[PDB]
Write a protein that binds this ligand. Structure first.
Ligand code: CL
Ligand code: CL
Ligand code: CO
Ligand code: CO
Ligand code: CO
Ligand code: CO
Ligand code: CO
Ligand code: CO
Ligand code: CO
Ligand code: CO
Ligand code: CO
Ligand code: CO
Ligand code: CO
Ligand code: CO
Ligand code: MG
Ligand code: MG
Ligand code: MG
Ligand code: MG
Lengths: 308, 308
């Protein structure tokens, strides 16, 4: 693969983002080494709260959630998907596939040897993060899903399809503008600029351009088979599994029901509806941090595992 | 469903079979209540060693293994699949499907609330038993697979296909004769009669007739999707998972490799090749019992789980 790397000057002076970058080198099956970025804040003796972003955001989306949780004594880890943030960015849309993202982030997870994880995932952060849970369930102590899903090509998803068709018809993808359109609150120019930071020009956006087309909404899509298999693992996942979808995101709203129907770990936890749009982290960051803090505190009294 | 029930007189005076019958009523989705038979020998405070038979045998196949393990202080449980043994027998070939067998035995397993299980499975005992492991992995402390598989419609299986075509072309299925043809040692007339016992005439054999046709050897077969999903669970199964295939069964020999390739619990156990034919329990019962006894003894020092 041809690979782009955003210059570091782009990440200077960003509103409410001073977290030091960490990097991991993962090797693709084609031999290409890709550098993935994450932040890691707080004490290493605490279990990691893993925060996963989706399309077309980056770990910046969690900046307030990170600050709140760190202030409460937690360890917080937030990676950038390949194509996004401070991670490397394959140069062709055709370089990105759902299975490739899963393989890349699986390597990242194993190489950083993250365990005892409390996962919060949203959009593609969940499409990929939930595949990590299904591949490595004993690495996860609890999961929170918000405005996400694990599609299997079934039914209609017209909310999402409206976004899909727009995202493919448009000749350019104005990322800060999209973030603002998917948040109830009005993002400042500085905040929108931070979302534009990874992408000095359109050539850096090929992962952002193709992501919607990778969502498996038809039976013929790539990754339908793999996602159906992953659901069989999630049907056995009995540790706390919380839904925290927002009230004003018709793109993903329909994704919640299958978790409640199929995942045993949803039975003995309280679910909530958060206030906000698709990018709920901009609308309800304090509430998300409070939810995760309380979830962590209750783990010893909840169902848990040993010997991994 | 129309359902046949073999008269109890058929099970009197069988060579080396005096174990008292236990019964469980399971209700099919179509409303039909089916009675399933099992034997349960030894102390209830010991973990159950669950022995599962396949086509066209019944729990009688394990009579010596049961005796050996009971003499060693173990609890042993051996059920008859619907269509077989002392279990009820739907009257039409079309009543039997792979998914129905899994549903029936899943109900059986849950209703008897078997836990801490050490499973030994062979032929369809494994095609169904391994689906129980994938559905309820925390119920299983260890698994031993012998002369079995979990097919996903891939590759060629010409050994099995030779049996398939015979089994479908033949107008009648002489069950004792088949058992003798699939065992290295010569079964006595009494032993063959015990294998014929469940089937007073051909009308009782519809489950035995169709079973080979249910094995998913083409991509279009029913249960391919479900078995691929189950494999994703087995890819996470890290408790002892032993292969004990025999040396002289070309029908199933090719089924072993995928377990060693995909199941993590195969890594830190010793695998063995048993002597004998397809129905290896007739050829090496003492060795099977010794293997299971040793496997049970080592569990506390092996990888194990808590809190289920
Ligand atoms: Cl998308
Ligand atoms: Cl068969
Ligand atoms: Co290097
Ligand atoms: Co750090
Ligand atoms: Co999306
Ligand atoms: Co559990
Ligand atoms: Co909800
Ligand atoms: Co504990
Ligand atoms: Co009754
Ligand atoms: Co008994
Ligand atoms: Co068979
Ligand atoms: Co384990
Ligand atoms: Co072997
Ligand atoms: Co222990
Ligand atoms: Mg907004
Ligand atoms: Mg706290
Ligand atoms: Mg023989
Ligand atoms: Mg013993």
């Amino acid at each position: 693969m041809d690979v782009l790397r955003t210059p570091d000057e782009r990440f200077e002076g960003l509103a409410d983002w001073s977290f030091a970058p960490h990097y991991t080198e993962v090797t693709d099956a084609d031999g290409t080494a890709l550098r993935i970025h994450h932040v890691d804040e707080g004490p290493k003796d605490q279990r990691p709260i893993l925060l996963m972003h989706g399309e077309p955001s980056w770990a910046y989306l969690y900046r307030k959630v990170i600050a709140e949780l760190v202030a409460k004594g937690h360890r917080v880890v937030a990676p950038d998907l390949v194509g996004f943030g401070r991670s490397d960015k394959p140069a062709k849309r055709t370089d990105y596939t759902y299975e490739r993202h899963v393989a890349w982030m699986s390597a990242w997870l194993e190489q950083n040897d993250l365990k005892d994880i409390v996962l919060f995932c949203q959009d593609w952060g969940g499409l990929i993060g939930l595949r990590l849970v299904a591949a490595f369930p004993e690495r996860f102590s609890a999961v929170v899903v918000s405005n996400t899903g694990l599609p299997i090509g079934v039914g209609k998803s017209e909310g999402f399809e409206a976004w899909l068709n727009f995202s493919q018809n448009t000749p350019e993808l104005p990322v800060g503008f999209i973030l603002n359109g998917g948040t109830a609150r009005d993002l400042s120019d500085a905040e929108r600029s931070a979302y534009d930071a990874p992408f000095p020009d359109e050539s850096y956006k090929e992962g952002a351009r193709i992501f919607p087309a990778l969502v498996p909404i038809t039976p013929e899509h790539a990754s339908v088979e793999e996602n159906k298999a992953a659901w069989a693992v999630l049907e056995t996942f009995d540790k706390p599994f919380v839904t925290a979808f927002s009230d004003a995101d018709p793109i993903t709203r329909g994704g919640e029901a299958m978790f409640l129907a199929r995942v045993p770990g949803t039975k003995n936890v309280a679910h909530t509806t958060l206030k906000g749009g698709h990018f709920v982290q901009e609308d309800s960051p304090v509430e998300i941090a409070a939810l995760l803090d309380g979830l962590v505190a209750g783990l010893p009294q909840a169902h848990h595992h040993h010997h991994h």
